[PDB]
RNA sequence: GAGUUGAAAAUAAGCAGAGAUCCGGAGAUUCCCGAAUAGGUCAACCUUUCGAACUUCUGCUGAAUCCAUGGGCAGGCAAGAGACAACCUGGCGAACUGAAACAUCUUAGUAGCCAGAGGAAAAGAAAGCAAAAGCGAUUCCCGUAGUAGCGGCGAGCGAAAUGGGAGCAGCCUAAACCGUGAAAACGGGGUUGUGGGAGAGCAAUACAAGCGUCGUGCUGCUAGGCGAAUCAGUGGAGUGCGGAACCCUAGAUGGUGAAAGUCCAGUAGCCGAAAGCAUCACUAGCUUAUGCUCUGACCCGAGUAGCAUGGGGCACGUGGAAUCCCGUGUGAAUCAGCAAGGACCACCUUGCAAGGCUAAAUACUCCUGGGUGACCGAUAGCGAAGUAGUACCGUGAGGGA
RNA sequence: AGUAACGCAAACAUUGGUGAGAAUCCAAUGCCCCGAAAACCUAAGGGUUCCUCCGCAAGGUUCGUCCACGGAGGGUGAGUCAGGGCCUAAGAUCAGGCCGAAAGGCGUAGUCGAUGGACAACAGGUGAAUAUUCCUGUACUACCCCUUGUUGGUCCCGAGG
RNA sequence: GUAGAGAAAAUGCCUCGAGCCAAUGUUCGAGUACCAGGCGCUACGGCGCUGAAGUAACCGAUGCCAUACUCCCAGGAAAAGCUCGAACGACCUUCAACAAAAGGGUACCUGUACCCGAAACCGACACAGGUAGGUAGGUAGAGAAUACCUAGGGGCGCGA
């Protein structure tokens, strides 16, 4: 499978080298590049080695699956394929615009993210609880 | 929050109590290793939890010994001693529940 | 080794030279002797290998000066 | 005279690694009343006898060791004829 | 600051905003072999009275033998031992080759081996150069110079002084003498050269200079954080194209379906260290210290220098052969001296051997962190872009895709 | 060059069977060869080649349903057998010791070193793959345990063997 | 038993002993063991069930007594276990140690598969070769030669 050189890069302690990237899981984004350009969505899984993200209705691929279990029954499934994090921008639903993202400090002693075309705060204090309970 | 709690609990015990506790733990670890092979359903997380518990205990023990003023050689000697004097006793956890039953 | 303890003499590295100028490796050796020497301050002899120069020096400065410069205890000898 | 030094220094709780369950062993239980236990290579017979004698609380007749071509010690533990094997087979989870 | 349990999916369970996984500092554990070190062995095992063997260290004990030596016993986180690419120092030390043969000579004090120590080592504070004018420990580069010379006067080897730079730094001790002993030692005094010191008297005294526990200091390193600016169209995908805009203390770099200052990570700029490390300042303290006059009687590094022989090395091959350093044998002089100035003698100049220690400038790459490349792009570049010192071959050293 | 060869001149044959496919795989019946081996076992060596199930790319001098091949899963049980916990030979290392540019060389006690000395187990059964090892019978060494009998035993040393 | 510095030993003198030696043999171990057949099943592979007789003679080892003999010259390992024992030295000492016949108990590591006159080791090969030891049936034969056979194993990995 994995072309032997396309495997995961490594530190001396054997742990893979993670790209840092600008997005989280619960987020909503708009797709800037690729055939999926323009479509809006929400992010499910994110792989921090390749720097790639997966979005529920987007980048659909038609996969043939062979179920041989005493009979031959096949399945044609449509899955979602990872797309590169540089192809998406954070999307504001309110003023309905996709922007870049800066960091800001809130008086709570907190550090958060905001869209720089609006000034709209992205991260909610309970966001992680909201996603865990899902 | 289990970690901080457990450590505060550890540093407040005595030496003998630590020893005994350690033994009991290693035993439970044994019984666990038995269940694995029996293919009786159990928790994969448990090996980790227990092993690391034992670790933390030993660490504390040694860290005290260092305050007392003891070296590496003295350490290892008294350790051989303690491992010689070890007798197996049946684990209080699950073997006592087949003694009763 | 061929070495005097007391003066630290070494065998010297020297070419034997013929009438023909043809050189050859050779060793000149220290003149070493197995001697007993009287030690007055020990009331007793000491068996030693000595260079002869050392024997001389022992006549001149006395044994103890020599052994103290060379750092060798007559007791352990 | 002195303290009885165990043949090596091991820690007894790691010596009995596991029961070996295959078609083979089970009938050694049935016929011989003999358990089958993979143990630490560095472990001896006296160590194994004390270990099982105290742990499951059964008196053990005789122990036979073995060393696999893979370097893993394997022990036949034949208990006494008072203690039935299948007892410990149910107690442990080895079902004949 | 959000997901995580290596490569590496899948499965199973956990751990996680009272902060996980992760990154850095300091600790902890570290089976068996290996210096291997309780004793043994056929490395990775055995036997054990459970022991760091042996050598140094501290104490107790005390053979032949009075003092001693040896031995015995005990203490001790206990100094060493082994490993290490190249460079370096010492020790041994070739041969092919060149000379159109070869022996003196060359190769070359090279390779190799052995031992040793360091981040550099070695050398080093004038018994030195020079020449009648002067310099002022050592090392390194340029030059003098392929000069003077050496040489079966063949092949070849080959300086130095003046001159220019790099870099700078000077210190401890022996003896005379005064204390303490029966000594051997210890304590003060004393260290220099167009002479010092000891000796005997009279003056000056406070600053100056060198070293350095402790500690907030300064800076840097070892994790990090903030960080400007774009859209639609174009045939799989646009960073390209045509058309509009904008940032720039940022147009380094890497990635992104296709080439991007404006998409991501970043860059300029700017913040940031509980802990450890490093250079620096400060840091109680510790060190030292001057001045003149008289006195050739006291000292100024002895089996040493020299001499006779045998050699070695100096550019220098015994030559008229100094200087330097060694085998054998002899063997001085103390400053009214001794050595050097290319046999030797006279005169003058210069210097103070036979006790030690010292930073930098210079050499190197098993490597670490940055950077560049008229360097390679899978027959290349490392032997090695995948099990690479692997497979395989060899009893073995070794070879090796 | 689709040529030489296919590794002895012990010899195969037929009927069934399995299978997509059989001169070659299994079984039966003949026939033939070895039998101081071409039998059975053990030392050394090899290293999992052993057994079962699956497979038929490569290997196998043809074939292949088969295999010492590939894939999975198993398998080696000791007081008495063999070594070590006993003893020494040749030889090796060698505390101290003697010598040696260095590395080292010689060498005494010591300690290693079996191919030898010492020392206790056999029959039957089970058996996909182990058996003087597991089972059932009778045995035998070495310790420990108690009773009884004595008071000194232990090593170092002297000897016989 | 005695003697000499003399415990044991060696050595000298005195004494008591006619038997001794060891393969093998008889008996227990040992029979409701094993086994020819017999009965029944057949997954037609193997399995369950009951079992008669189990003695004698003659050949006869290269094996055992046996380091038993006789002869020869070339003159044929050491040390420990083992048996015996005073002085010297060290250490330990009373329910401590040693001495005994029974009785009960107790039981260290490592090898153990397979091949081994070989297709698995050694020969680069599934190679007409090399490889220590053990066991040694029948008929003929002086014989472990040869021929033909048993047990057991094979028909040589190209055929027609
Ligand atoms: Mg693939
Ligand atoms: Mg793109
Ligand atoms: Mg079995
Ligand atoms: Mg075994
Ligand atoms: Mg570690
Ligand atoms: Mg272990
Ligand atoms: Mg050792
Ligand atoms: Mg050793
Ligand atoms: Mg004393
Ligand atoms: Mg005395
Ligand atoms: Mg002494
Ligand atoms: Mg000691
Ligand atoms: Mg060293
Ligand atoms: Mg070395
Ligand atoms: Mg070093
Ligand atoms: Mg030559
Ligand atoms: Mg020549
Ligand atoms: Mg020539
Ligand atoms: Mg020539
Ligand atoms: Mg430097
Ligand atoms: Mg130096
Ligand atoms: Mg100076
Ligand atoms: Mg000077
Ligand atoms: Mg100059
Ligand atoms: Mg300058
Ligand atoms: Mg200067
Ligand atoms: Mg003095
Ligand atoms: Mg002074
Ligand atoms: Mg002068
Ligand atoms: Mg003067
Ligand atoms: Mg004075
Ligand atoms: Mg940023
Ligand atoms: Mg940006
Ligand atoms: Mg565009
Ligand atoms: Mg454009
Ligand atoms: Mg992109
Ligand atoms: Mg770019
Ligand atoms: Mg920066
Ligand atoms: Mg004077
Ligand atoms: Mg001379
Ligand atoms: Mg010369
Ligand atoms: Mg000369
Ligand atoms: Mg000179
Ligand atoms: Mg000169
Ligand atoms: Mg010399
Ligand atoms: Mg001389
Ligand atoms: Mg003089
Ligand atoms: Mg001279
Ligand atoms: Mg001079
Ligand atoms: Mg002088
Ligand atoms: Mg001189
Ligand atoms: Mg000097
Ligand atoms: Mg020096
Ligand atoms: Mg290629
Ligand atoms: Mg290559
Ligand atoms: Mg190519
Ligand atoms: Mg032809
Ligand atoms: Mg033809
Ligand atoms: Mg043909
Ligand atoms: Mg042929
Ligand atoms: Mg054939
Ligand atoms: Mg025949
Ligand atoms: Mg065969
Ligand atoms: Mg066989
Ligand atoms: Mg074998
Ligand atoms: Mg295999
Ligand atoms: Mg097979
Ligand atoms: Mg095939
Ligand atoms: Mg074929
Ligand atoms: Mg088939
Ligand atoms: Mg196979
Ligand atoms: Mg010998
Ligand atoms: Mg030697
Ligand atoms: Mg020695
Ligand atoms: Mg010896
Ligand atoms: Mg041995
Ligand atoms: Mg043997
Ligand atoms: Mg034995
Ligand atoms: Mg035996
Ligand atoms: Mg078998
Ligand atoms: Mg049997
Ligand atoms: Mg029987
Ligand atoms: Mg017995
Ligand atoms: Mg004896
Ligand atoms: Mg007697
Ligand atoms: Mg008597
Ligand atoms: Mg007698
Ligand atoms: Mg007869
Ligand atoms: Mg014969
Ligand atoms: Mg005889
Ligand atoms: Mg006595
Ligand atoms: Mg007795
Ligand atoms: Mg076996
Ligand atoms: Mg076998
Ligand atoms: Mg053969
Ligand atoms: Mg064949
Ligand atoms: Mg063959
Ligand atoms: Mg016959
Ligand atoms: Mg005949
Ligand atoms: Mg006959
Ligand atoms: Mg025959
Ligand atoms: Mg037959």
């Amino acid at each position: 499978r994995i072309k032997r050189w396309e495997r995961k890069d490594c530190k001396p302690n054997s742990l893979p080298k993670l790209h840092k990237m600008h997005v989280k899981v619960g987020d909503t984004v708009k797709v800037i590049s690729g055939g999926e350009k323009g479509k809006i969505g929400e992010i499910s899984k994110i792989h921090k080695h390749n720097s790639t993200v997966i979005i529920k209705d987007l980048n659909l691929k038609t996969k043939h699956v062979k179920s041989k279990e005493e009979g031959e029954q096949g399945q044609i499934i449509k899955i979602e394929a990872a797309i590169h994090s540089s192809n998406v921008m954070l999307y504001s639903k309110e003023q309905e615009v996709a922007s870049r993202v800066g960091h800001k400090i809130l008086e709570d002693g907190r550090k958060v993210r905001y869209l720089i075309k609006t000034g709209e705060i992205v991260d909610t204090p309970d966001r992680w609880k909201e996603i865990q309970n899902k | 929050v289990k970690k901080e709690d457990e450590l505060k609990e550890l540093r407040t015990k005595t030496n003998e109590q630590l020893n005994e506790e350690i033994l009991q733990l290693k035993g439970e670890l044994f019984m666990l290793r038995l269940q694995r092979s029996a293919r009786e359903n159990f928790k994969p997380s448990d090996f980790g939890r227990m092993r690391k518990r034992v670790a933390r205990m030993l660490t504390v023990k040694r860290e005290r010994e260092i305050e007392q003023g003891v070296g590496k050689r003295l350490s290892r000697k008294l350790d051989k001693a303690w491992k010689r004097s070890i007798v197996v006793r049946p684990p209080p956890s699950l073997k006592k529940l087949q003694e009763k039953a | 080794r061929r070495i005097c303890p007391f003066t630290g003499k070494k065998s010297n590295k020297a070419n034997r030279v013929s009438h023909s100028n043809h050189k050859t490796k050779r060793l000149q050796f220290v003149n070493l002797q197995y001697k007993r020497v009287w030690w007055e301050a020990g009331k007793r002899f000491v068996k030693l290998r000595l260079s002869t120069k050392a024997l001389k020096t022992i006549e001149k400065n006395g044994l103890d000066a020599v052994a103290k410069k060379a750092g060798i205890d007559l007791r352990k000898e | 005279k002195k303290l009885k030094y165990p043949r090596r220094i091991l820690d007894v709780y790691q010596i009995l690694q596991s029961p070996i369950i295959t078609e083979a062993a089970i009938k050694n239980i049935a016929d011989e009343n003999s358990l089958l236990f993979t143990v630490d290579v560095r472990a001896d017979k006296k160590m194994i006898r004390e270990a099982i004698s105290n742990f499951f609380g059964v008196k053990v007749r005789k122990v036979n060791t073995l060393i696999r071509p893979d370097g893993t010690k394997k022990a036949y533990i034949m208990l006494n004829k008072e203690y039935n094997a299948s007892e410990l087979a149910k107690k442990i989870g080895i079902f004949p």
Side-chain angles (χ1 to χ4, degrees):
Chain A
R1 179 107 325 181
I2 304 296
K3 311 180 170 218
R4 310 150 24 250
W5 69 87
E6 282 225 77
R7 298 174 146 190
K8 290 198 208 174
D9 283 353
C10 293
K11 311 171 191 176
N13 56 32
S14 72
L15 296 181
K17 294 185 171 188
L18 308 184
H19 291 176
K20 207 201 224 157
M21 72 197 74
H22 64 284
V23 66
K24 309 219 193 172
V25 156
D27 285 331
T28 173
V29 289
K30 176 182 177 196
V31 175
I32 313 147
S33 186
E36 293 277 341
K37 175 173 162 212
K39 289 185 179 179
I40 308 173
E42 180 191 0
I43 298 193
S44 305
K45 295 221 160 178
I46 165 180
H47 315 302
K48 282 185 186 169
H49 59 307
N50 321 320
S51 161
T52 43
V53 295
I54 306 172
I55 322 176
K56 270 208 173 175
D57 297 333
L58 308 190
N59 198 14
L60 280 187
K61 287 172 175 175
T62 311
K63 175 167 180 193
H64 315 93
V65 175
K66 345 178 189 227
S67 168
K68 304 182 176 181
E69 307 164 358
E70 314 171 352
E72 291 184 8
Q73 192 179 356
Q75 190 55 24
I76 290 194
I77 293 198
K78 276 196 189 154
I79 65 164
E80 294 104 31
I83 157 188
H84 196 264
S85 78
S86 74
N87 291 317
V88 292
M89 248 191 312
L90 286 179
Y91 188 78
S92 189
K93 317 171 187 180
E94 298 193 328
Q95 327 105 351
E96 297 163 359
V97 170
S99 333
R100 268 169 278 131
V101 47
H103 292 242
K104 181 186 178 173
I105 300 177
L106 304 174
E107 296 186 3
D108 299 338
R110 210 188 183 190
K111 163 181 174 168
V112 295
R113 307 185 298 151
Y114 71 94
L115 302 174
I116 64 170
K117 266 182 183 173
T118 166
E120 174 73 17
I121 298 177
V122 174
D123 304 340
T124 319
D126 236 340
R127 194 68 220 173
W128 55 278
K129 252 189 212 175
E130 173 199 347
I131 304 172
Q132 288 162 7
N133 309 329
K134 286 166 187 172
Chain B
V1 90
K2 300 169 184 175
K3 286 203 173 175
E4 317 168 343
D5 287 334
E6 281 178 36
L7 230 64
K8 295 169 189 176
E9 291 189 2
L10 283 161
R11 306 184 169 170
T12 61
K13 298 177 181 176
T14 187
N15 302 329
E16 335 173 336
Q17 185 174 357
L18 279 216
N19 287 280
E20 160 192 18
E21 196 53 67
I22 285 174
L23 286 207
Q24 166 188 358
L25 275 159
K26 286 176 174 165
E28 187 188 353
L29 215 23
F30 178 107
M31 197 65 82
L32 211 49
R33 229 187 306 100
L34 262 177
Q35 288 174 38
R36 173 161 67 191
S37 46
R39 295 186 175 193
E40 153 175 23
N41 82 317
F42 71 107
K43 304 188 184 183
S45 64
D46 225 325
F47 292 110
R49 137 158 76 256
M50 295 208 43
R51 230 149 52 210
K52 283 183 184 186
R53 177 91 187 281
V54 191
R56 287 179 238 271
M57 305 206 54
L58 289 168
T59 305
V60 166
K61 207 175 177 188
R62 180 83 196 107
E63 185 168 5
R64 281 180 194 164
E65 298 162 9
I66 276 160
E67 293 167 337
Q68 301 164 12
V70 302
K72 232 191 243 219
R73 286 180 182 278
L74 233 200
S75 153
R76 283 172 199 176
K77 269 186 196 183
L78 299 200
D79 191 35
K80 303 281 185 147
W82 179 58
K83 279 182 182 164
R84 266 155 217 153
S85 35
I86 292 301
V87 184
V88 224
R89 73 180 180 185
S93 57
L94 289 157
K95 168 57 193 165
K96 282 191 188 166
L97 301 180
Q98 319 150 7
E99 292 168 352
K100 297 165 191 170
Chain C
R1 320 149 156 249
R2 266 156 254 196
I3 270 170
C4 179
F6 293 73
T7 42
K9 307 255 261 184
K10 341 203 166 187
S11 303
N12 139 273
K13 166 175 187 163
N15 292 349
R16 198 107 179 285
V17 182
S18 60
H19 178 81
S20 178
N21 236 142
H22 160 87
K23 323 277 178 169
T24 295
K25 284 312 180 197
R26 175 212 172 172
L27 242 40
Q28 313 198 300
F29 297 125
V30 179
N31 184 17
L32 279 205
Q33 300 291 327
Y34 296 64
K35 273 283 301 162
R36 289 182 311 168
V37 303
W38 182 247
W39 180 28
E40 60 175 15
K43 286 184 175 184
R44 65 164 208 101
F45 294 97
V46 179
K47 298 164 159 187
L48 294 164
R49 271 181 111 203
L50 302 164
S51 77
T52 58
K53 285 298 184 125
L55 205 25
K56 230 172 182 177
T57 306
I58 285 174
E59 315 181 292
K60 166 200 200 110
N61 303 331
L63 174 64
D64 322 340
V66 184
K68 174 198 164 192
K69 273 189 204 166
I72 323 162
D73 241 27
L74 302 182
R75 312 160 165 233
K76 305 164 192 181
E77 299 178 2
Chain D
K1 331 183 181 186
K2 218 180 180 177
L3 9 64
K4 257 66 237 60
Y5 294 91
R7 186 184 153 281
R8 298 283 178 262
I9 308 131
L10 287 159
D11 203 311
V12 276
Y13 290 85
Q14 299 169 0
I15 64 177
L16 306 165
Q17 279 166 27
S18 50
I20 12 169
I21 41 176
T22 186
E23 192 71 17
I26 303 170
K27 53 174 191 160
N28 275 301
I29 288 288
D31 313 337
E32 206 185 320
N33 75 21
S34 161
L35 290 149
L36 263 201
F37 273 114
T38 287
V39 320
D40 192 336
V41 170
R42 233 199 154 184
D44 332 332
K45 281 161 167 198
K46 272 149 201 163
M47 299 193 70
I48 280 181
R49 287 212 289 95
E50 307 158 2
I52 288 157
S53 168
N54 292 143
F55 226 91
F56 304 89
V58 292
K59 308 177 181 187
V60 170
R61 209 175 74 240
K62 180 190 186 168
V63 182
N64 289 345
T65 56
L66 179 55
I67 296 185
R68 299 173 163 173
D70 301 323
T72 346
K73 215 134 162 286
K74 152 183 168 176
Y76 295 82
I77 305 118
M78 61 216 65
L79 329 133
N80 236 315
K81 306 243 175 162
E82 303 212 317
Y83 311 73
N84 187 33
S86 193
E87 295 179 351
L88 282 185
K90 306 145 191 179
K91 259 189 183 177
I92 286 175
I94 319 146
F95 288 100

